[PDB]
Design a protein around this motif. Structure first.
Motif, PDB file in Angstrom:
ATOM      1  N   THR A 217      89.689  18.903  -4.539  1.00 18.85           N
ATOM      2  CA  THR A 217      89.042  20.052  -5.145  1.00 18.85           C
ATOM      3  C   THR A 217      89.489  21.339  -4.482  1.00 18.85           C
ATOM      4  N   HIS A 218      88.903  22.448  -4.912  1.00 18.28           N
ATOM      5  CA  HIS A 218      89.333  23.752  -4.441  1.00 18.28           C
ATOM      6  C   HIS A 218      88.159  24.705  -4.241  1.00 18.28           C
ATOM      7  N   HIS A 219      88.091  25.328  -3.068  1.00 16.30           N
ATOM      8  CA  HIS A 219      87.097  26.372  -2.827  1.00 16.30           C
ATOM      9  C   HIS A 219      87.702  27.752  -3.056  1.00 16.30           C
ATOM     10  N   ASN A 220      87.048  28.514  -3.934  1.00 14.06           N
ATOM     11  CA  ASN A 220      87.567  29.775  -4.462  1.00 14.06           C
ATOM     12  C   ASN A 220      87.540  30.942  -3.484  1.00 14.06           C
ATOM     13  N   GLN A 221      86.380  31.203  -2.889  1.00 12.91           N
ATOM     14  CA  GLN A 221      86.246  32.339  -1.985  1.00 12.91           C
ATOM     15  C   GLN A 221      87.194  32.223  -0.792  1.00 12.91           C
ATOM     16  N   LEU A 222      87.281  31.031  -0.205  1.00 11.21           N
ATOM     17  CA  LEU A 222      88.159  30.818   0.945  1.00 11.21           C
ATOM     18  C   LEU A 222      89.598  30.563   0.499  1.00 11.21           C
ATOM     19  N   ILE A 224      91.011  27.807  -0.519  1.00  7.82           N
ATOM     20  CA  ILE A 224      91.575  26.664   0.194  1.00  7.82           C
ATOM     21  C   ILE A 224      91.348  25.366  -0.553  1.00  7.82           C
TER      22      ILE A 224
ATOM     23  N   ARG B 213      79.324  28.474 -10.569  1.00  8.48           N
ATOM     24  CA  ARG B 213      80.678  27.933 -10.553  1.00  8.48           C
ATOM     25  C   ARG B 213      80.706  26.610  -9.794  1.00  8.48           C
ATOM     26  N   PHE B 215      82.574  23.064  -8.160  1.00  8.21           N
ATOM     27  CA  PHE B 215      83.802  22.521  -7.600  1.00  8.21           C
ATOM     28  C   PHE B 215      84.447  21.600  -8.624  1.00  8.21           C
ATOM     29  N   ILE B 216      85.756  21.724  -8.790  1.00  2.24           N
ATOM     30  CA  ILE B 216      86.442  20.963  -9.825  1.00  2.24           C
ATOM     31  C   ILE B 216      87.452  19.997  -9.231  1.00  2.24           C
ATOM     32  N   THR B 217      87.396  18.752  -9.685  1.00  3.03           N
ATOM     33  CA  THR B 217      88.289  17.721  -9.192  1.00  3.03           C
ATOM     34  C   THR B 217      88.890  16.931 -10.337  1.00  3.03           C
ATOM     35  N   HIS B 218      89.669  15.914  -9.994  1.00  4.35           N
ATOM     36  CA  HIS B 218      90.398  15.159 -10.999  1.00  4.35           C
ATOM     37  C   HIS B 218      90.439  13.669 -10.678  1.00  4.35           C
ATOM     38  N   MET B 228      81.716  18.419  -9.712  1.00  7.40           N
ATOM     39  CA  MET B 228      80.666  18.076  -8.757  1.00  7.40           C
ATOM     40  C   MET B 228      79.319  18.659  -9.166  1.00  7.40           C
ATOM     41  N   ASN B 256      80.559  26.229  -5.813  1.00  5.79           N
ATOM     42  CA  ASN B 256      81.810  26.881  -5.450  1.00  5.79           C
ATOM     43  C   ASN B 256      81.667  28.395  -5.503  1.00  5.79           C
ATOM     44  N   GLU B 257      80.788  28.928  -4.666  1.00  9.57           N
ATOM     45  CA  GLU B 257      80.559  30.361  -4.635  1.00  9.57           C
ATOM     46  C   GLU B 257      80.732  30.914  -3.230  1.00  9.57           C
ATOM     47  N   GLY B 258      79.915  31.905  -2.891  1.00  5.54           N
ATOM     48  CA  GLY B 258      80.027  32.583  -1.616  1.00  5.54           C
ATOM     49  C   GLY B 258      79.388  31.865  -0.444  1.00  5.54           C
ATOM     50  N   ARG B 491      85.575  28.831   7.476  1.00  6.15           N
ATOM     51  CA  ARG B 491      86.891  29.325   7.085  1.00  6.15           C
ATOM     52  C   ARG B 491      87.897  28.971   8.171  1.00  6.15           C
TER      53      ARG B 491
END
Ligand SMILES: Nc1ncnc2c1ncn2[C@@H]1O[C@H](COP(=O)(O)OP(=O)(O)OP(=O)(O)O)[C@@H](O)[C@H]1O
Ligand SMILES: Nc1ncnc2c1ncn2[C@@H]1O[C@H](COP(=O)(O)OP(=O)(O)OP(=O)(O)O)[C@@H](O)[C@H]1O
Lengths: 514, 514
Positions: A217-222, A224, B213, B215-218, B228, B256-258, B491
């Motif tokens: 998956t992917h975290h947007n703010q960071l 990564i 928002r 978290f998006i996976t596959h 998620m 998947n936010e701040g 981070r």
């Protein structure tokens, strides 16, 4: 015209409901005070007998699974609650609002959630019942519930719509109740032993040295890329380093691999780590815990599975050594340096002799694993610990304290399969580093955080892991993991199997009406 | 030459260890049998007094945080276990192996995990101690543990290396122990009330109608995109449909936010659903549960937070109505149709009067939310339920049974913030459908499975949700959520802050040696 009758039934049902709502009746009332649950009802009023009517006024609520009448002034409803049934004898002469009696007794559809307030009784037929003074629709059912039973097998129509399955196959609930009973049994056992139940991350910035393909998956703010966890091991161990001597977590793990009867993309395990303990202690603990579980399920430490057969969870469990069982059946012992040339040249011999055809590549680890897998695993039906796996088989384990070329660990086998496992965890930071690097090069970034943590002196610790889903499987006497998971991962059906499904769903109805 | 001294110390420490291993001593022994934990030790032998030595032979193990001697034949070690300390008076004359006494008493480094077997005593200084007959290094520490305390504040050096933090700031453990105490308190309360603890999917093929928002996976084998979970609500409700009347899940959610002091990418909440119950019942239950929690923490239903201040969890809690508090302070009542023109034209008046500057867009919902947020929320320090939110504010809620333009729900406010919330869940499948579709168009695929499920008659049910991390925050008297999460999402530092970190880490050491 695709699924013609159930659309018709849904529409006509919605109609029925809204006209029932103008009629003056709220189909979804806010609060119905249930004075007693029907298992409590059965437990309290079973002492009644035929034609005897209690003076009490109790109110129950559940789902109608049978509406049948022998008269216009006498209806019989099978109301279901907590997977048990109570009959509702709607007798007009005993119903206060005669005007409402009629309206209610016609509006009620099979599947409706209803509430009734009345007197406990046992009819002349011996059937325990309740004679209502007043009843009410609590939530109308807008579809035709399948018959009882339905979906046996055809597992997918069951598991896609679990909410229907639990209704028409109430026995399946027994399974899930078992599973919860399991986890509680775990927690208690650990909690009473000073363990701290904790929560470690599911999302990681490091993929892990494991070979299993992870969900990504992917975290947007960071900005990564992150990975879903394969095990909580590292973090828990960091907690034992941190000064929390006994920790455990019953958590959700994720593997982006295949789906079969023993595999689900997301599953649940329990891991614990316990300072100043070795795998022997963990063995006794395992016997103890599983023992208590089984003895709750029955009363004795002996269970019965599928005709019948007995699984003896009586302490102590059988236990055998790996290379000692392989050498127990090979004929005699095995050459020294097991990872060496003579040991592989030797292994191949029984790997053409004992009906054993190994595979390519023919690593010593592989021929040994297959020879143990086809040969020794076969008749391990009773709970038994297979201990002292070689370093050939055990990369991230600690060497055995006495006999060479072995490690301190075990795998608990029950009914052909592995249920739990344990280790005398490796606490040598240098060796752990070497293994981590060598591992990373083998699969070709490593977890330097964890390496640092254990470099700050990781105490001698005992590790344990249990397959919650699979233990649940084994104790529920089922051969499919979807039977112990409420909403197992289903391949989304396209309009083909969809159309076919609905078409059959009408084939049933047309089979009725004709 | 970057971090010059700690590299030197690591290397020299590894040296020390391996030469200690040729010397004949295994630095990582497999099993040390600990006969007693030092809290048990203190609980058992506190009755001793000065110079009095017990006849017992007990063995303890922990981490050395102080090694100091007044003589070559007399050393004093502060050994730490379970966040408490026991002194180890290593007296040569009382040590059996005089040859090993020396070797051990020199090899021991601050941070080493050690085990000692000896006699309980209390010295002439009043210090409770243990005089060893035999000791051993259980796991050597290869780095210089920071002083005590260290990292106050500078939260990131703490939270990146939690395993160090828990050592040098042992008080922080008190926090996590509280958190577990919380979840147990929840489970028990629910379990004793017939609730079934369950596990619902974290990975979904449907993103959800929520605005947050995900978290998006596959998933590879099925070749499908998955999401998620934002909440377990739908599945749990499908369980109540299915016939399980009371369900609950204390689970891990993902946004998947701040990232701030009250937000972490993955967090933990508790949801339960309870058939034939309304939000009033859930209010009493909430009072009851939180009450029991606080009274465990102290003894009375009254807690004290930060100098001091009291939080009164005494039943019953305060409770107020939304529009009734807004109308309580606006001056008089508000125009009818609240979602209407006159109500917005009215709202704007106090939205220029009461120091309230609202924002754009100026929806009635928004001006009402801000007017309630700056004005009414401010001095809600004591636990209080804010109930009967308008349909303007409540899209997916059930209308109030009596007074119009309101719904049946509440938000529990404590200390300016929302801790928990509840609903008399909407069980009208048609309305739920309309809302789901309208929602999907508002954010512009819907969950047809769940719509079908509730179309099969979803019983009147009470829903509840609790913020586990935030309740833990509030009860631990901390203002940062990373204080109640073991490994909060950090981070990943690049080589800049890394280099600076290590550089300072030497600034300390050079500050010592000079
Ligand atoms: N998809 C899954 N579903 C349920 N349990 C799993 C799954 N994957 C792993 N496990 C559990 O994790 C533990 C370790 O499994 P392992 O790493 O050997 O996976 P594996 O090679 O797929 O094992 P097996 O082939 O025996 O299923 C086992 O006890 C098993 O119970
Ligand atoms: N990142 C997070 N960390 C911890 N708890 C969270 C997080 N996001 C949501 N929650 C919890 O979920 C519940 C519902 O939150 P909501 O949907 O209002 O999110 P929000 O708009 O970010 O709320 P707030 O702005 O008050 O944090 C709250 O009780 C909160 O405790």
């Amino acid at each position: 015209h695709h699924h013609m009758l159930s659309k018709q039934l849904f529409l006509n049902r919605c109609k029925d409901v809204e006209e029932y709502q103008k009629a003056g009746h709220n189909p979804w009332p806010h609060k119905f005070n249930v004075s007693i649950t029907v298992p409590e009802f059965i437990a309290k009023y079973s002492g009644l007998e035929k034609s005897q009517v209690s003076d009490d006024i109790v109110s129950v609520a559940g789902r109608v699974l049978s509406k049948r009448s022998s008269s216009s002034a006498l209806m019989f409803i099978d109301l279901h609650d907590s997977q048990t049934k109570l009959q509702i004898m709607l007798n007009k002469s005993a119903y206060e609002n005669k005007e409402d009696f009629v309206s209610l007794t016609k509006m009620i559809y099979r599947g409706d959630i209803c509430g009734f307030t009345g007197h406990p009784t046992r009819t002349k037929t011996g059937e325990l019942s309740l004679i209502p003074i007043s009843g009410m629709i609590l939530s109308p059912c807008l579809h035709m519930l399948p018959s009882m039973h339905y979906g046996l097998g055809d597992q997918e129509t069951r598991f896609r719509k679990r909410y229907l399955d639990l209704i028409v196959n109430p026995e399946s609930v027994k399974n899930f109740v078992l599973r919860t009973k399991v986890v509680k049994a775990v927690r208690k056992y650990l909690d009473d032993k000073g363990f701290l139940e904790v929560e470690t991350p599911i999302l990681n910035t490091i993929p892990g040295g494991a070979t299993a393909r992870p969900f990504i998956t992917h975290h947007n703010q960071l900005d990564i890329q992150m990975y879903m966890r394969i095990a909580p091991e590292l973090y828990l161990k960091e907690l034992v380093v941190g000064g929390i001597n006994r920790v455990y977590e019953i958590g959700r793990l994720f593997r982006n691999e295949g789906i079969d009867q023993t595999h689900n993309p997301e599953f649940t395990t329990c891991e614990f780590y316990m300072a100043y303990a070795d795998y022997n202690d963990i063995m006794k603990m395992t016997e103890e815990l599983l023992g208590n579980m089984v003895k709750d399920i029955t009363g004795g430490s002996t269970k019965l599975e599928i005709k019948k057969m007995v699984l003896d969870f009586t302490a102590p469990f059988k236990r055998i050594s790996y290379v000692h069982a392989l050498e127990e059946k090979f004929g005699e012992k095995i050459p020294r340096p097991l990872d060496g040339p003579e040991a592989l040249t030797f292994l191949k011999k029984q790997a053409i002799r004992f009906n054993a055809i190994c595979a390519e590549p023919q690593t010593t680890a592989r021929v040994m694993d297959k020879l143990f897998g086809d040969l020794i695993e076969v008749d391990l039906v009773q709970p038994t610990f297979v201990c002292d796996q070689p370093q050939l088989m055990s990369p991230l384990a600690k060497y055995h304290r006495s006999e060479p070329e072995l490690t301190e660990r075990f795998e608990l086998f029950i009914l052909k399969r592995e249920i739990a496992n344990a280790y005398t965890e490796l606490n040598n930071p240098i060796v752990q580093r070497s293994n981590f690097e060598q591992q990373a090069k083998d699969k070709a970034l490593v977890d330097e955080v964890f390496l640092d943590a254990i470099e700050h002196a990781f105490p001698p610790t005992g590790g344990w892991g249990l397959g919650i889903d699979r233990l649940a499987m084994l104790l529920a006497d089922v051969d499919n993991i979807k039977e112990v998971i409420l909403f197992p991962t289903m391949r989304p059906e396209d309009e083909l199997e969809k159309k076919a499904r609905e078409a059959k769903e009408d084939a049933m109805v047309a089979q009725e009406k004709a």
